[PDB]
Amino acid sequence: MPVTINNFNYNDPIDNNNIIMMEPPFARGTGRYYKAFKITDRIWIIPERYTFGYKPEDFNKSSGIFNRDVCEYYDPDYLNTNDKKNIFLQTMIKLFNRIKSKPLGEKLLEMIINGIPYLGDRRVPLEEFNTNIASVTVNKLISNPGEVERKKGIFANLIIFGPGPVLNENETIDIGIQNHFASREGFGGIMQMKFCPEYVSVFNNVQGYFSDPALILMHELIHVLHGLYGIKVDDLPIVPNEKKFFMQSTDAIQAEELYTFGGQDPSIITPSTDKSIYDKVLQNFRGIVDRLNKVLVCISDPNININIYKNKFKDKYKFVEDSEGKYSIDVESFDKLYKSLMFGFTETNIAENYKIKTRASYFSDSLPPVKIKNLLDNEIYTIEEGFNISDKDMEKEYRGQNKAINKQAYEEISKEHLAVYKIQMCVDGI
Amino acid sequence: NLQCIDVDNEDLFFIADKNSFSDDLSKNERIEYNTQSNYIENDFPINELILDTDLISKIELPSENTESLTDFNVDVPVYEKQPAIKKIFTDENTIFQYLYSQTFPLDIRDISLTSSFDDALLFSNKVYSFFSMDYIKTANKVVEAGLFAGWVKQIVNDFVIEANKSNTDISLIVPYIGLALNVGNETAKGNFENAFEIAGASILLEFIPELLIPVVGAFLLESYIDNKNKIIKTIDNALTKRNEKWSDMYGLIVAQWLSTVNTQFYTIKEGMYKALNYQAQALEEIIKYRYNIYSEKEKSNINIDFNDINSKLNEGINQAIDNINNFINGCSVSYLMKKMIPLAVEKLLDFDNTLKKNLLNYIDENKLYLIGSAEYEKSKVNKYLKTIMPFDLSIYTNDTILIEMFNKYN
Ligand SMILES: [Zn+2]
């Protein structure tokens, strides 16, 4: 149905419906419960710092870096108080309203909501549904504070956290169990995001400009979409040559990251690799279709109706049913769906449709990030037009995003809190 | 003491490794009567996606409520920091060292432009300039208070004229890119137009990479006893698959071009942008110093329009960058069409010959079941493999200015 974004404050009481105490997948059941807010069906916002896999001290600017590709900005006091956590929620609500304000973004969202993870894993027998895995189920606490622990399970598609140590490094992480990823095997799994709306990336087309946070969020939501469909597969990556001094160092770049950006970048992935991915994705779907024809019981939950979820997955992966009830893959349906998911929803295609300026390539030079003064101020940023507000004379030629023209929309960032990976080039003499 | 220049990792050259590109073209292919071609267009029309009913959710979303999670088995990733500094040692004087020679510390007030690169590295009050020595000496001349406005107007005017130097043999060429960066091979040394007229775009490249061009693997056609139709279809399918391999090879070359050559030329474009700025920054600090020499009486007499100067300098660079973009883009496509595609065509023509021999021999082995039509199919194979699939860059890049460069070629 039509996507409805919810309204709420951080101060609002827990009602165990739209506002809950959630035990996220990486908490490992260690009793670390977070206050969670359902923004749309199957999408949750936790307005707190992402601390999973990081050390408390890592949130401080040190003589080191996490990733060599990012101008890394640290700020430990971001989202440290209730008033600040509330700003986060309302900003996320405003960005979500910007997304659904055009049909394309609305489709992206409804894809995400309805693209529920398969109730299983590679370890689950074909004849079975199993909810009792961390990539499918997440616990909510329904007990009064300081009482006998009583928990209940909910299905979730996406959980959005605030940023980790580096504010401008927005990532979408998937869930691995015993060195295997359901969101890479056709099953799909609960997706998580570390996101920050205030501190955006900067670029400059040589042939600068600050980035619209709704696009940055949509970029990440595409990753989420791939993860929920179990098509974020690993294939031969682009690896940089590091044998010479003048060569840039970076991590392996997966095709999935280049498809997601879109534009000219998919051409860096060879037709051979294109076909390898396609085949793997098809071979995963063939497994799923086989499972649905064989699934009889659900051991972990007796209240799961088998026919309901058989019909839903059929509608998720667009399987075809004959008169007897057997499911199969219609090659044309799969091809259309594959190409829509991989080459339809892209940062470039979306930017064109949303009249937002973006960087030209993934391999473009990145510049120091900027803090957006106020996203809740409709003279700066709106739901319908973002920064490029026409009644402020900012629509033409992306004037609203231009750093020279719209100087009041942004503040520059102190060099003391920026961590850039530098190469020290010495003469080798003296 | 160590003499170390600092450079951001992002300002280095990205060059994709040889292991980044699939070798799958080298594999054998089975050709059967019902074998069909596989193309994956890296594109999907956005206007269809909105209207496509086959992507709207047709079943209601189930309730979220379920049984509690008890199996907390999960892999939690661990993040540790790595040092933000990496020390390296080289005797080379590439883009980075040539760009550093165009900078100055904050402490230094009295600076002068020079044409000697080594003197610009050594003394922290000399700054390297890549414009004509006629410009350089004009930027170092001290004048009277009344002649100061005649100096500024002229020197900023001279900056524009020096930045738009372009002569000459396809498209336009900027002769001071070599002096500005010394990128690739001894670019500052000797004449740039001469060195280019000999080797072309290749001398600008910091690293010439080994191209991956696999030998396309043999086709293995299956036999069908006494079935003329399946034999003919197999020959057809083999011929259509041949086109698939040409297309694939072209994709492989492009993927290597973009991630290996075109990235270098992007850096060189960014390098020139920095150089032109550093030159305008050096000119600004020179004017600043000469202005401060005067007394309050001399300064008040002549009101300099600084609003016009910054406008003139920004526009001066803007015109120059357009010329540099034009030349460098043409170079990047030049290298594709002259040093990359023809090498692949060569190997694809080899594939054609191997396939021709394959097919004729296959026709030879089935001459009995083909009745008296074996010669007919022989010439069909002969005629078809005489026509090749031409390369078109528009398949790999949408709505671009690089296609205009490509359409210029024969
Ligand atoms: Zn991404």
Curated annotation (Swiss-Prot), chain A:
Top-rank taxon: Bacteria
Record: active site: 220
Regions crossing the membrane: none
Domain notes: Has protease activity.
Ligand binding (Zn(2+)): 219, 223, 257
Gene that produces this protein: botB
Role played: Has proteolytic activity. After translocation into the eukaryotic host cytosol, inhibits neurotransmitter release by acting as a zinc endopeptidase that cleaves the '76-Gln-|-Phe-77' bond of synaptobrevin-2/VAMP2, blocking neurotransmitter release. In vitro the LC only has protease activity after reduction.
Lineage: Bacteria, Bacillati, Bacillota, Clostridia, Eubacteriales
Protein name: Botulinum neurotoxin B light chain
Organism: Clostridium botulinum
Subcellular localization(s) per the UniProt record: Secreted; Host cytoplasm, Host cytosol
